[PDB]
Design a protein around this nucleic acid. Structure first.
Lengths: 207, 79, 60, 99, 63
RNA sequence: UGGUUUAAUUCGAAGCAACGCGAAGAACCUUACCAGGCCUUGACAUGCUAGGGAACCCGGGUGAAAGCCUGGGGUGCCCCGCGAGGGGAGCCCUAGCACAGGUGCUGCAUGGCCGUCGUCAGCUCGUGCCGUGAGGUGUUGGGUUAAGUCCCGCAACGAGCGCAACCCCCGCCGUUAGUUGCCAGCGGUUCGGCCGGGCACUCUAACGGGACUGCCCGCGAAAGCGGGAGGAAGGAGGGGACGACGUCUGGUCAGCAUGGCCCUUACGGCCUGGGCGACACACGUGCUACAAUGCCCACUACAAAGCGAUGCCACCCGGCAACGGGGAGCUAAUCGCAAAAAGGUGGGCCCAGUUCGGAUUGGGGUCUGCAACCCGACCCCAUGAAGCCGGAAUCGCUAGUAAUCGCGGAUCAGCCAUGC
RNA sequence: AAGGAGGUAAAAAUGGUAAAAAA
């Protein structure tokens, strides 16, 4: 039925807040408002190289953003003439001191948001669902993971019946904690509908 | 309720006090019904809105300072 | 109507008593927990998706 | 004579900010009355699990605001200097006063 | 401090127990078989969303 | 909520899984519904053609209001200027255009998100064996448990998601720590933690330990069961989040996105009104009750949690009160919301449509808000219905649970909150 | 009784739901 965000349950010692800044009772709103706007217009632009996490810090002008990209290469631009315009606008609609920090994660086939990103985008480019996606779960357990699952729900190929085609390989202990799982859902848009791409990836015990 | 005072509106005021400059035509055409009835309106054809249309109500005494739009039914159909 | 409605209050009219809260991450007035300036479904989507500090998937 | 209150959402780090201060302060001067914990005020919130008219089915969420309090004796220049300079709350709120 | 008159009473009992079982734990030998240390339970439990007194539920229709 | 009805009584949900459900604050707002006034390159963004205005500060007529016709100001900047001028930009105006927009249909095209069966114990992988094979096996057999929990058997041996465990609240202890607490231990006192002092005790809130049938005895082949103790803690210690594979084309296009169909000076947009509260009945969840284990007035008691800056609002005062005028402290464990109530301790009623129960009823008051008629809460005093404890039937609940009693927060000008 | 089994027993007030069609 539900499943609930592993995330919205991993906020113990397994998922530390995406946005780390204390707030005043009154303040809270407008702060998060500008915040979600940052992530927002960032999303439209700095997608180009897989935007996973978006680490946020705020003390008092301390607008530190640690954009976990996927590969900041052809995204910082030559000499940083693209990091420039982004920090620029960042300042344009943030009445304080901005930060960029392109902290991409070492490895691709980890952190399910970008996994599912490529996943849904393959269907976005019409491609073979079960074939290339089984190849995706494949690639995950071909990277060194411990359990990969990709649910893809919606109008495959049209045909009224919106199935929920599902594939998996490796253990996915969702009721556990220490085990740690990364969850990421891509919002797949068929030219003819909206199908939901979703992925869980397992890591391991002890941590 | 105004605790100290009685609520009314100035449309009616400016209107009544200007026909009182003579005592002319036997019609007025008001859109407000939230207003409190006053005795200086004399009380001819206060034509008030209802919800569908303006419907003239007569006014003399016992409607003293109680609300206007109360002698305009609105709640059509009975039981 | 919808689009015009958010604009209706977004610009404060005549009387203080004609303002009504607005989920700026979904767009409604019903059950918008003013503390966050967020509706209830917008609330839960935010807190769940990890994009909300101070909270806790409470277990008290 | 020093009133330092530390308001925090991450009690783990927030406490780490409470004893740290006290070391370098008990170090760069004299006594520094222990970090003393203060009532973590919690703002209770809650709402239903979904969108459609499902009166039951609900999730609670709340704000954990831990309060901290350090008192130091008669201050020193080292103490005040570094322990007003160095820090990295990265969010946590630091509010001091002269009572 | 706290609870109620009776709750007060409870804690008083608890302590009068614990105090003589300190400055003479010779009295402990003949007081646990009497049950003068098992503390307590009781909590007007966290109200269940959906039910009243975390147990007390609304009248079921079916119809 | 059906039905009923109106100009409109705006839609959604429907055996359990809809009916105090979206609705966690519908007077106008909200608002999607109606009658009427009216705007429409549109309340919103996006860019071009050709034209003018600098942005932009005020005002008059009109009108229910949106809208509408004009009037005072007005002339910041780039290039070329002690001169004249135009073009260019934010910048608004008008035609034309590309367009916006539509809570219009379509959940039988969809995502996501809840429901629900259901914390029900279920769904399977691996090598081996059986079966031509589909496949079976493992998982069918017995005792046992909340449990596919464990043991025994056994052609299997195991392994993963489920159950559990790792997570939190709550009970016992500890170490850090002392502006909450206190003679607990000392001094004094305006004897009231009130003045110094102190960390012992509560508390606070952190880091661990502590319980496993571990010990003792009787039974069972073991899994387990009986009895007893050590201990704050027994045999899963109490609770909470936690909810599989799957079904059900469940629920939702009126939170959102959303494939399509669709109106485009009208299904778009504003305003003022009116309805969402209507009434010959019917129904679910509910508050109160119908009474002496009680109603009433007086004195004292112990709560826990959650709040409060243009808010919490103690205090005198005016007012019987509703609340109003002057007024302290308060970014709170230090200030106030706040009196917990039942308990207890006195006095009244004397079994009665009663000092019961206030349903409703009239002449007046307070508060918020432009505004309290429809349609607000609250105050007064006069009114004082039904109700004599409920047939068929049918609901809750297994321990601090039920029953009883008070208390706060959410959103909110206010409040229909007897709801959650 | 532990089972498989050959003969003789008990056991249902009611009903119409169409179907082009997805993996």
């Amino acid at each position: 039925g539900n499943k609930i965000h592993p995330i919205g349950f991993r906020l113990g010692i397994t998922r530390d807040w995406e946005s780390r800044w204390y707030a005043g009772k009154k303040q809270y709103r407008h702060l998060l408002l500008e915040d979600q706007r940052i992530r927002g217009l960032l999303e439209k632009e700095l997608y180009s190289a897989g935007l996973a996490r978006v680490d946020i810090e705020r003390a008092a002008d301390n607008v530190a953003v640690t954009v976990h990209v996927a590969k900041p290469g052809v995204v910082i631009g030559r000499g940083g003439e693209r990091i420039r315009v982004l920090r620029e606008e960042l300042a344009k609609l943030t009445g304080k001191n901005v930060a960029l920090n392109v902290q991409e994660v070492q490895n691709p086939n980890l952190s399910a948001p970008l996994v599912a990103q490529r996943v849904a985008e393959q269907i976005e480019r019409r491609f073979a669902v079960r074939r290339a996606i089984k190849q995706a779960v494949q690639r995950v357990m071909e990277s060194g993971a411990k359990g990969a699952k990709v649910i893809v729900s919606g109008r495959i190929g049209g045909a009224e019946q919106a199935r929920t085609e599902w594939a998996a390989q490796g253990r996915v202990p969702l009721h556990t904690l220490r085990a740690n799982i990364d969850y990421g859902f891509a919002l797949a848009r068929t030219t003819y509908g909206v199908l939901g791409v979703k992925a869980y990836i397992f890591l391991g015990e002890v941590i | 309720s105004l605790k100290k005072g009685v609520f009314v509106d100035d449309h009616l005021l400016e209107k009544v006090l200007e026909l009182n400059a003579k005592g002319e035509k036997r019609l007025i055409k008001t859109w407000s019904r939230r207003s409190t009835i006053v005795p200086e309106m004399v009380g001819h054809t206060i034509a008030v809105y209802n919800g569908k249309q303006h419907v003239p109500v007569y006014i003399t005494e016992n409607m003293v300072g109680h609300k206007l739009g109360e002698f305009a039914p609105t709640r059509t159909y009975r039981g | 109507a919808r689009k015009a409605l958010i604009e209706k209050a977004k610009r404060t009219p005549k009387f203080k008593v004609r303002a009504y809260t607005r989920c700026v991450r979904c767009g409604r007035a019903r059950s918008v927990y003013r503390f966050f300036g967020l509706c209830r479904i917008c609330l839960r989507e935010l807190a769940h998706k990890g994009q909300l500090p101070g909270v806790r998937k409470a277990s008290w | 004579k020093i009133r330092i209150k530390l308001r925090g959402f991450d009690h783990k780090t927030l406490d780490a900010s409470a004893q740290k201060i006290v070391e370098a302060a008990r170090r760069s001067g004299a006594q520094v009355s222990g970090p003393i914990p203060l009532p973590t005020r919690v703002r209770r919130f809650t709402v239903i699990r979904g969108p459609f008219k499902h009166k039951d089915s609900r999730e609670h969420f709340e704000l954990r605001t831990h309060n901290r309090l350090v008192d130091i004796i008669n201050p020193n220049r080292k103490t005040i200097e570094q322990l007003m300079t160095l820090d990295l709350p990265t969010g946590v709120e630091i509010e001091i006063k002269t009572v | 401090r706290g609870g109620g008159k009776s709750g007060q009473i409870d804690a008083i009992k608890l302590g009068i127990a614990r105090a003589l079982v300190q400055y003479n734990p010779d009295y402990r030998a003949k007081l646990k078989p009497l049950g003068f240390l098992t503390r307590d339970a009781r909590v007007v439990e966290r109200k269940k969303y959906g039910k009243h007194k975390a147990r007390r539920a609304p009248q079921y229709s079916k119809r």
